Write a protein that binds this DNA or RNA. Structure first.
Ligand SMILES: Nc1nc2c(ncn2[C@H]2C[C@H](O)[C@@H](COP(=O)(O)O)O2)c(=O)[nH]1
Ligand SMILES: [Ca+2]
Ligand SMILES: [Ca+2]
Ligand SMILES: [Ca+2]
Length: 341
DNA sequence: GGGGGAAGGATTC
DNA sequence: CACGAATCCTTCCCCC
């Protein structure tokens, strides 16, 4: 099996660059402004020019501006990036018939048939790279290997605007030399748990008793890491189906006042419904981000679909449940709809 | 003992 | 100061 992973470079920022080419070469910082105060919010993404100075996703817009006061700061336009993304996916869709659109800027292609051997895969990568740059002016990094994980890891090492193949010989090398933190799906929480177990490399996961591993990072994560360390990971390429739709907004000020929160919650619901399509959810969750940035939620599954009126009403009950069962003030509030009919 | 949901939280990208 | 969604997990519960 040959997997070709495609990852659009600094996507949001690059799109803004495509929509306004005079931006090229300048530090471009796409931000999600929260509205709690001038420049409150975080950086969603930044082009590499901004990144080489530490301005990256997750840092507050205020910290980025102190580092790069003259960069171009743009409000994130999710809808625009999604439409652009959809076009690129369609473009890729004609290269493989087997595609897994992992997110707005990532997709895996099972080109096991379309190609044979990594030379032809590599060449196909360039075909895809040139095609995307041609029709959309979007540079992407391509990762190629035997499975999604290493295909993704290949892209991680080749970005930006690169292409890399990780042959079966290197797979083995990385299995014992790649920091396990750099393995997809292993975040800081898991990375630390593995460090405390003596696992710093994928192969080290073979030094632990499975049940001890399972006990520490969960069975699913244990079997995942083990399979990769044995060079046996082989999950198929298949785009998952949207299982939930929601929206969560940040309030101007933290609150515990029902009437003060409702408007935000209702706006969340309204946008969530517009997003749903003709899709009808049977489950609804009200999600709140507490003042200490903790996330709490209360939901309910109905035996039928949820009309907007029912949503408006149940969400208020769920929000009252949250306030009733958690003392903290609420910073962000929203809803998530799932279990579509 | 354990299937099968549902619920609330943990994690990751 | 810090802004959508999938899986996975663990807990609880109904119940055969
Ligand atoms: N809003 C937001 N989007 C992020 C963040 N990190 C990554 N992304 C998205 C941006 C898009 C995709 C690739 O870049 O990942 C983040 O911290 N905030
Ligand atoms: Ca990515
Ligand atoms: Ca990317
Ligand atoms: Ca990591």
């Amino acid at each position: 099996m040959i997997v070709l992973f495609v990852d659009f470079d600094y996507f949001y920022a690059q799109v803004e660059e495509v929509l306004n080419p005079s931006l090229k070469g300048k530090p471009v910082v796409v931000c999600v402004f929260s509205g709690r105060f001038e420049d409150s919010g975080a950086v969603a993404t930044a082009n590499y020019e901004a990144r080489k100075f530490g301005v990256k996703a997750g840092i507050p817009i205020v910290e980025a501006k102190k580092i790069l006061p003259n960069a171009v700061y743009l409000p994130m336009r999710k809808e625009v990036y999604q439409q652009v993304s959809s076009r690129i996916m369609n473009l890729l869709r004609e290269y493989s018939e087997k595609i897994e659109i992992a997110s707005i800027d990532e997709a895996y292609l099972d080109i096991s048939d379309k190609v044979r051997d990594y030379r032809e895969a590599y060449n196909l990568g360039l075909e895809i790279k040139n095609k995307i740059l041609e029709k959309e002016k979007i540079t992407v990094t391509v990762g190629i290997s035997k499975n999604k994980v290493f295909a993704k890891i290949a892209a991680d090492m080749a970005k930006p605007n690169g292409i890399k193949v990780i042959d079966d010989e290197e797979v083995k090398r990385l299995i014992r030399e790649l920091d396990i933190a750099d393995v997809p799906g292993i975040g800081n929480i898991t990375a630390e748990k593995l460090k405390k177990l003596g696992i710093n490399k994928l192969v080290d996961t073979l030094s632990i008793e499975f049940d001890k591993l399972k006990g520490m990072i969960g069975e699913a994560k244990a079997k995942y890491l083990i399979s990769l360390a044995r060079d046996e990971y082989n999950e198929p390429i298949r785009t998952r189906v949207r299982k939930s739709i929601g929206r969560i907004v940040t309030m101007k000020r933290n609150s515990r006042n029902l009437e003060e929160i409702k408007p935000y919650l209702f706006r969340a619901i309204e946008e969530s419904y517009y997003k749903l399509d003709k899709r009808i959810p049977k489950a609804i969750h009200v999600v709140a981000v507490t003042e200490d940035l903790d996330i709490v939620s209360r939901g309910r599954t109905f035996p039928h679909g949820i009309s907007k009126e029912t949503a408006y009403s149940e969400s208020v009950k769920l929000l009252q449940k949250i306030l009733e069962e958690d003392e903290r003030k609420i910073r962000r509030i929203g809803v998530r709809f799932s279990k579509f009919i």
